[PDB]
Structure formats: C-alpha cells, structure tokens
Nucleic acid binder design. Structure first.
Ligand SMILES: Nc1ncnc2c1ncn2[C@@H]1O[C@H](COP(=O)(O)OP(=O)(O)OP(=O)(O)O)[C@@H](O)[C@H]1O
Ligand SMILES: [Mg+2]
Lengths: 77, 302
DNA sequence: AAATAAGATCACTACTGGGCAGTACCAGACTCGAACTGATG
C-alpha cells in the first residue's frame, strides 16, 4: 500500500496491538480501546481529525491524549 | 438481461469484484418478507413493534437497506416542501462491554444518527439519561420517521437476569408509546427470548420447494459471476447446502471469497477445490445448525 | 443457617467547561423650545 499511502493521505494499511492480561480478574476494555486508539493515531502526521468525543484530542507534540474521566463507550465511539 | 454484462471482462478485476459485491438476489423469501414488512409499515394496526427474526446470513440487513431506500423514494415527492421529515432511521445496537445493556449509549447514537445538534448540551425539563431520553423522544416526534430500524436487536437481552430480561425493553416500549414511532427490531434467533412477528426462514431441505428455491438462487448467482467461462455450480447443490444450511446471505460471501480468489489468480472458472478452500468449517456449520434448530424449536409453538 | 458476593448509598477528591451583571460607542432618528417671517382683519 506504500504507493497508495504516498498518493492518498489519512490511510493506514495495517494496525495491530496485543491483548493485555489484566491485573484484576476481568479484562479491561477501556485499556483496549485507549491503546488501540494510541496505536492507530500516534504514528501519524498531524492530520487534523475530530473524533466525536469531547475528551480525546491531539496535543502539540502529536501524542494522542485520553482523559481518565472519559467513559469507555465514548472511547469506543 | 438476466446475466452479467460481458463488457466487464476487459475491465480490471476490482471493477468485477465491485459489480458482483453489489448484486442482491431477490429470492422469494426475501421479497415475501419485504412485502409483509411494507404492509405492516403502511398500516400498523395500532402496533408499535415489528420484531423480525432469522439466523445469521438470511439477509436481514439488506432487507433493512431495501426497505429504507423504498420508503425514502416513496416519500421523495413530499420532502421537497416539508423539511425535518427524515423518512426512516436505521441504527445498529451496541453490544455492551459490561454485563448490562447501556441505554445512554443507545440514546446518544440514535441522536447522532438523526443529526440532532448540541447532544452534549442537552437539558432535563423535569430512568437512564432523562435528558437524552427526552431529546430522542422529541426528535422522533418532530422529525417523524416512518420506521425506526434497530439492527442486531439481540444485544438488548444482555442483562443476565430472568426478572429483568423482559423489563430491559421498557425504555423502548415507553419511547414508542408516547412518540408513535414504529420500532422494527431486526435480530437473530436470540430475540425470541422475550408487537408483530416476522420469520426470515431459510430453505430447509425437508420441503422440496425450498430446495427448488435454493437451486434457483444458486443458478442466478452462477449466472452473475464475472468469469470468462460460466462455472457449473448446481451439480454440487448438496455441498452448497451442507456448508450453508440454506441461507442466501452467507452463500453470497462464500461465492465472493471464491470469485476473489479466482480473479487474483487470473482464472476463468470455479472448481470444487476452489470452493473447498474458502468453505465454512465443519464445526462452524454444526454450531450454526444447533443455534438455528434452537430458534426454530422456540418458534415452532402454534 | 452460616458464609460469601455484590449492588446501593454517603462522603470526599480532582478536573474541566463555561456565562451574567455591567460598561462602552456610534451615528440615525424623532420631538419640540425658541425663534423667524409672511398673510390678514
Ligand atoms: N440476498 C442477498 N443477495 C446478495 N448479497 C446479500 C444478500 N443477503 C445478504 N447479502 C450480503 O451479505 C452481507 C450482509 O450480511 P447478511 O445480510 O448476509 O447477514 P444478516 O444475517 O442479515 O445479518 P447479521 O448476521 O449481522 O444479523 C453483505 O455483504 C450483503 O451484500
Ligand atoms: Mg446484520
């Protein structure tokens, strides 16, 4: 997809994360959502995109930030 | 004509894949259920729930899309003057991450799909999310949708409580009572765990008419497959029914897999091994048949 | 029946949107003190 990535921006060919064994006794879906969002968006140029959630946005350094106040279905959206 | 255009052979393989992926066969069950649903929508008879069943792969979602398009084009002459009159709203239920279905998320997604502004600034003017609930009620009253489709309605039952399984639907019941909006809950056979009932039956092999219909849809699928040489498929109808159980939806994506594999190799026809490569697993069909048998037994009460 | 879970409630903590009583300006416009001036019995 590299020629297509060069031709068209805002495009990732493949994204991949690893599931995390939880410290508690139940799987953490909020951590899954936030880490998938970090992996998907952080290794990108500052392509201005507005997710439909108030808390999550980009920063000056480009690293994505998620407030601890953000509720998990909002992260999923 | 009844066959695929012969000009796509010179076109690139992506064009052939795009053409075949958009072909939606009108098998008799699909059009019969479509007519029943349209008759129910036109005259509701005072009902407010249009529960529709069917195991995965019958074609409920495409039926929803067809009904959406048909109702939009039916209303089209009268939205030129009347605005804020979205014909039909169709949403997909969210599988909860916790043990219980989330109703705040349902309300906010229903509001988003209606393009309702200022969702974050809602107010409660005197329950779960009263402000969002009242906002959705007002949006349904004023936008006046003909039907409110909720695909994947089986996720409403994620409550893990016998004394709360039926009560989980009180929010939708009250939202449909006081706004007068038809709620057509499309779901798999889990939805029978609980009003007009429609059954999206597959093609059971016991009845010869279903076998004839399955062979008909198989032939019309083979006619529209974009290959240089038309692949013979009706001979292995027994194989195509073993891994499909008679669902015209998963047959379509099975053929899509096989056709994409053929096109990627610049092939010209489909053999048995090509279908075997992209066939459903032996255990997968067993689990699917167990679930569909449970649903059929649940719906078998007369 | 005793033991082990689990939701409900109170209480405190940290975080982040975000508006109202109030001031200021700039000509356009209306209304009428005060006067000016001409016709008239
Ligand atoms: N009759 C049909 N003709 C052509 N394609 C179809 C048909 N029915 C379904 N599809 C295809 O199947 C996909 C949609 O899933 P499908 O309708 O088969 O499943 P469903 O059982 O209705 O849905 P779900 O399992 O999510 O409840 C799309 O790719 C659509 O093109
Ligand atoms: Mg579906």
């Amino acid at each position: 997809a590299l020629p297509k990535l060069e031709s068209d921006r805002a495009r990732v060919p493949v994204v991949g994360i690893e599931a995390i064994a939880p410290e508690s006794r139940y799987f953490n879906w909020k951590e899954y959502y936030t880490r998938a969002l970090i992996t998907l968006e952080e290794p990108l140029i500052d392509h201005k995109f507005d997710y439909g959630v108030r808390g999550i946005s980009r920063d000056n350094f480009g690293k994505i930030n998620v407030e601890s106040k953000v509720v998990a279905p909002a992260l999923r959206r | 004509s009844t066959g695929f255009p012969l000009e796509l052979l010179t076109r690139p393989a992506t064009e052939r894949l795009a053409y075949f992926e958009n072909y939606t066969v009108a098998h008799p069950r699909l059009k019969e259920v479509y007519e029943i649903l349209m008759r129910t929508i036109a005259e509701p008879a005072g009902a407010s729930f249009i529960f529709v069943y069917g195991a995965s792969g019958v074609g409920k979602t495409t039926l929803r899309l067809r009904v959406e398009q048909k109702l939009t084009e039916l209303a089209l002459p009268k939205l030129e003057s009347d605005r804020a009159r979205v014909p039909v709203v169709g949403i997909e239920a969210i599988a909860p991450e916790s043990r219980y279905f989330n109703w705040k998320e349902y309300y906010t997604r229903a509001l988003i799909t209606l393009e309702e502004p200022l969702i974050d600034h809602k107010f409660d003017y005197g329950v779960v999310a009263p402000a969002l609930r009242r906002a959705l009620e007002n949006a349904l009253i004023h936008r006046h949708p003909d039907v409110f489709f909720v695909d994947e309605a089986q996720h409403f039952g994620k409550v893990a409580s016998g004394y709360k399984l039926q009560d989980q639907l009180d929010c939708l019941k009250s939202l449909a009572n006081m706004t007068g909006i038809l709620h057509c809950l499309l779901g798999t056979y889990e939805l029978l765990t609980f009003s007009v009932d429609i059954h999206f039956r597959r093609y059971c092999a016991d009845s010869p008419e279903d076998v004839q219909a399955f062979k008909s849809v198989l032939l019309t699928f083979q006619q529209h497959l974009p290959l240089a040489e038309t692949p013979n498929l009706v001979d292995h109808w027994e194989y195509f029914y073993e891994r499909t159980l008679g669902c015209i939806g998963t047959l379509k994506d099975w053929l899509k897999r096989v056709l994409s594999d053929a096109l990627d190799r610049e092939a010209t026809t489909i053999t048995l091994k090509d279908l075997q490569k992209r066939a459903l697993s032996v255990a997968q069909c067993q689990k699917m048949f167990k679930e569909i048998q449970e649903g059929e037994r649940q719906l078998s009460e007369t």
